[PDB]
Amino acid sequence: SLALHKVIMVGSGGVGKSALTLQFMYDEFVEDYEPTKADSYRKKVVLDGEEVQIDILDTAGLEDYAAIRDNYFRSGEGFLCVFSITEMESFAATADFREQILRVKEDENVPFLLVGNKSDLEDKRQVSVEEAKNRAEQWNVNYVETSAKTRANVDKVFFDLMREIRARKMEDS
């Protein structure tokens, strides 16, 4: 039976969680903002020779109830922690998102990638590449800048996350 890798999009409102998901799923991108509640997507892909399925849970950057947020996080196996390079506060918000994730999952090596989205808006950069890399290195995770608009590194973040999820499964069994 085809493996199933469960990905959870995490990050402040507006960073591009939905845009990254939709670019990856359907090769589409729209400029208009569309506040998300909670949407689940599934797609068949070939991962290193194997036909597998990726499941992506895309939710709002802000959830009123902590218990609900925990239920979202708990259903996942790997996380794309997204922040926008044009907004330093979204970058600051990643620390807590990570804390909340480590707690709910109770696992320090939880598959996780720090993602700096909106790389096409370089002229508006508020977060430097070094800052982000340094934060990622201290968290012992990789950092990748993406652009849901031009597709830059979009497949890369989802596939890299799938490989980390697959790695944990290979040992934890």
Partner 1 sequence: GQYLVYNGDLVEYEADHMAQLQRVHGFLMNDCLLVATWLPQRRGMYRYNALYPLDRLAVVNVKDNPPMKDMFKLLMFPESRIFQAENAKIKREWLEVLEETKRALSDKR
Ligand X SMILES: Nc1nc2c(ncn2[C@@H]2O[C@H](COP(=O)(O)OP(=O)(O)NP(=O)(O)O)[C@@H](O)[C@H]2O)c(=O)[nH]1
Residue 64 touching partner 1 (CB under 8 A) = yes
Tokens representing 38 are 């909670």
Helix (H/G/I), strand (E/B), else coil: 116: strand
CB 82 within 8 A of CB 15: yes
Q: Which H, E and C letters describe 30-61, residue by residue?
A: CCCCCCCCEEEEEEEEEECCEEEEEEEEEECC
Q: Give the tokens for residue 144.
A: 């990748």
Q: Does 109 bind Mg ion (CB under 5 A)?
A: no
Residue 42's beta-bridge partner residues?
55
Residue identified by tokens 């918000």 is: 93
Question: Shortest distance, CB of residue 126 to partner 1, whole angstroms?
Answer: 31
Q: Min. distance of Cβ 90 from Mg ion in angstroms?
A: 13
User: For helices 88-105 and 66-74, what crossing angle results, to 10°?
Assistant: 70
41: contact with partner 1 by CB under 8 A: yes
Asked whether position 148 contacts ligand X by CB under 6 A, the answer is yes
Does the annotation place 140 within a ligand binding site? no
Residue 70 or 131: which CB sits closer to partner 1? 70
Q: 46 or 62, CB closer to ligand X?
A: 62
Binding residues for GTP: 14-19, 30-36, 117-120
- Positions that interact with ligand X (CB under 6 A): 11, 13-19, 30-36, 60-61, 117-118, 120-121, 147-149
Binding residues for partner 1 (CB under 8 A): 1, 4, 37-43, 57, 64-65, 67-68, 70-72, 74-75
